[PDB]
Amino acid sequence: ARGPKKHLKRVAAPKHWMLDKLTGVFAPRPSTGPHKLRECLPLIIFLRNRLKYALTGDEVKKICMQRFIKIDGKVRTDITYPAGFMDVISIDKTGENFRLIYDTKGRFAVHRITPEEAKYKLCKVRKIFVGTKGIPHLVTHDARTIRYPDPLIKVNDTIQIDLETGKITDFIKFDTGNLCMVTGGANLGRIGVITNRERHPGSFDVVHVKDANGNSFATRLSNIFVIGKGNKPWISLPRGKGIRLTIAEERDKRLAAKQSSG
């Protein structure tokens, strides 16, 4: 190429968007924003494919630029605006609130939340640095810079932040025995408590996590988002509680649900 790309082919789109093959040759191509291209759900896919208020992209544009959709309390009219993990979507006209968090299968669940839960969000701290005139700054996973954080907050810790103002309100350390959710890799969407973090200098750390059913799985340190302190999550969880069922028990649950109703 001679410069940056503007198009996303539909088969080359992220698979967890759940787009089909025959609607077009193109996928909605997320704008630049606080989330990566491969780790976000654009607003057009949310309002059309998942939530089904709209039937076309033109109807998505008509919804969005009537100024109805807030992402983290800010009105967005970009139809391809990249929304990602822990982002709060508020529709004040229909009175709906959502958090973009993952299913046990690694797809952004339609997770409805309470309007008091939509006041805040959680962020994973990605860097701590001191800037000019000795002013400490943190940078989160969603491109937020906060000046003057708590001196106890470190990288990989999780801040509980207020969307009305944007300041630090509470925080959770990275420690063995805290609750976490996996935001990348093969264990995307699973939830469990951290049991062992092994360190590899000059390389990636590997965190071992144990499920509430006793299953154990490892990930990298980049894929760990600490959610709750010890055992109780600080946000609402989806219908599955991070418990990945195997295909056998999922078939059994489907058959029992078909037997009970019908």
Binding site: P136, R147, Y148, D150, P151, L152
Partner: peptide, 30 residues
Amino acid sequence: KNKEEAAEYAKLLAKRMKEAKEKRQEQIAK
């Protein structure tokens, strides 16, 4: 907002340094 945020960071830094030093004399006096 600059002078306000400087004020709360000054107070928080004072408290954090106090707790750290108190833990330091409590551990070193053994």
